[PDB]
């Protein structure tokens, strides 16, 4: 046969070329399987082995149990697990000054097993794999696509064993050793490895980025991966504000492993993807507001998709803050009440004030008894909604606008026995009560003004949706200007 002839002549590049072209006779398979047992004397043999295994795993018409058990001397359970369990490919760089063949971004194919850990490569030390098995509490079969020295692959193999989804392993490479109790150990030649990985258009994770396997698992399989979105009015305070938000995230027990650089590396994000700058906003300009809201939409959708790495949108928590209450209202209206998030309030510390991680749809629910707000209602067809929850009192200008714009009705809402200005605290109940008052007194056409913090307005927008025909007025300095965007326009429909 051709395979016996080529193997006799040690034509491993031609054998690998035949395997990659998937043009393989069944009668050849046995010989191919025997190649898996040859000594890894040069890179041709190892690459041929790797491609043979990948062909057996991708075109399972060549995967044969009789050859797996008889030719590879595998027990029945391990062979069947190789047949059934899916494989993962992870990337790891190696730099050898003496040999350029060993300086490369190599791949490791990993199949989880139950009670055996082995490899088909002869140059790999068994105890190095047993360390990974002990650290991850998972037995595994592993094969490599290049000959190399060292154990810098331990982090990549642990990542392949821990990660539930294989998408994040396509853009991220790993280097470093692993201890028995799950400690990541530093490795040499970080700069050349980073150069190699970025040359291959991938991001590299070094032992200085993550401390242990638990931190790695937080990034690989997150239950609530935290992303950041902060709207600011001061551009030169962008990065600083981001750092503050990072610190604000670290104060949460659920996100103690969070690091901005680790998020940017793992999910291929830049700083600009997490904030929005409005130098001078005109709330009477429809086109400028349209552009700002479309930018907000694009950035939030990118943060929730992350280039397809994230499958479940509810498994991502958007830590969101703003700098303008009027703009925060539309931000909340667009964001909706289905995405898990955390609304913060900036008082020089970015304090968490509203938490919608577990159950996002619980703002739309109303209250039968008002406990934190006081309402002065007069239900008529044109309702004038006034919200007083800040230091400045907008009630006078609110009533002046009420009779100035020929608004008959009146609905004033303010805090209960807190003397106007509100203190830091849990603000979900306040927003829920305001939404209750607004929805229970909804009319055909209504106008709304407010002097309130950004978080309250953002959560109120998330609660309202785009179902209410409300006209918003922005208060710059002693005067109100109509925002030319109604809160019920089709452009504000929440896609999340």
């Amino acid at each position: 046969g051709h395979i016996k002839q080529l193997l006799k002549n040690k034509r491993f590049e031609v054998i690998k070329a035949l395997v990659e072209s998937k043009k393989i006779k069944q009668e050849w398979l046995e010989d191919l399987y025997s190649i898996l047992l040859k000594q890894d004397t040069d890179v041709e043999i190892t690459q041929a082995k790797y491609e043979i295994i990948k062909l057996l795993l991708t075109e399972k018409k060549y995967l044969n149990f009789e050859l797996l058990t008889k030719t590879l001397n595998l027990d029945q359970q391990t062979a069947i697990e190789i047949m059934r369990n899916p494989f993962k490919e992870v990337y790891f760089p190696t730099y050898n000054i003496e040999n350029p063949e060993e300086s490369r971004l190599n791949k490791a194919l990993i199949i989880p097993l139950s009670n055996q850990t082995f490899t088909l490569n002869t140059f790999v030390n068994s105890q190095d794999l047993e360390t990974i098995k002990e650290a991850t509490n998972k037995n595994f079969f592993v094969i490599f696509d290049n000959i190399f020295s060292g154990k810098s692959y331990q982090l990549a193999v642990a990542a392949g064993l821990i990660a539930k989804e294989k998408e994040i392993l396509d853009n991220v490479a790993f280097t470093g050793e692993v201890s028995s109790n799950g400690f990541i150990i530093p490795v040499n030649h970080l700069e050349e490895k980073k150069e190699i990985t970025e040359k291959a258009k991938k991001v590299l994770i070094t032992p200085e980025d993550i401390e242990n396997l638990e931190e790695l698992s937080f990034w690989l399989n997150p239950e609530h991966l935290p992303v950041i979105f902060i709207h600011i009015n001061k551009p030169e305070l962008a990065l600083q504000s981001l750092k503050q938000m990072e610190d604000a995230i670290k104060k949460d027990e659920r996100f103690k492993y969070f690091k901005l650089e680790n998020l940017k590396k793992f999910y291929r994000l830049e700083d600009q993807d997490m904030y929005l700058i409005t130098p001078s906003v005109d709330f009477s300009n429809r086109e400028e507001l349209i552009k700002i809201l479309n930018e907000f939409r694009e950035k939030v959708s990118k943060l929730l998709t992350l280039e397809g790495v994230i499958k479940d949108h509810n498994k991502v928590v958007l830590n969101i803050s703003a700098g303008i209450s009027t703009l925060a209202l539309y931000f909340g209206v667009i964001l909706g009440n289905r995405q898990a998030s955390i609304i913060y309030h900036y008082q020089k510390e970015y304090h968490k004030v509203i938490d919608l991680t577990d159950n996002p749809r619980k703002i739309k629910e109303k209250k039968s008894e008002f406990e934190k707000i006081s309402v002065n209602k007069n239900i008529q067809d044109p309702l004038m909604i006034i919200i007083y929850l800040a230091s400045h009192n907008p009630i006078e200008k609110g009533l002046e606008l009420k009779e100035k714009l020929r608004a008959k009705g009146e609905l004033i809402i303010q805090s209960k026995e807190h003397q106007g200005n509100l203190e830091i605290g849990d603000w979900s109940d306040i927003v829920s009560e305001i939404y209750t008052a607004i929805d229970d007194n909804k009319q055909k056409e209504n106008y709304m003004v407010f002097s309130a913090p950004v978080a309250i307005m953002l959560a109120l927008g998330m609660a309202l949706g785009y179902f209410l025909p409300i006209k918003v007025f922005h208060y710059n300095r002693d005067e109100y200007i109509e925002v030319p965007i109604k809160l019920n326009e089709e452009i504000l429909r929440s896609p999340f």
Binding site: Q5, A17, S21
Partner: protein
Amino acid sequence: STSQKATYTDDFVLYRGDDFIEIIIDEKYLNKKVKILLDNDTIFNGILKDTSIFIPVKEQIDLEELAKHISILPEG
């Protein structure tokens, strides 16, 4: 647009190199007088002592068609 690196027939195996295409003739034609023809043009005619015949590749043609075009013709 084919990324296939190799193909096989009953007589030879085509392998795609960097700047060449290699015909690996079956060992059964060794030390025998053969005539290897690409289409109707002669690429070899003599005693085959080396099973490898290299030809230039220009346009990354489908290796299946090229294998359909190459033929080995022993004499005797």
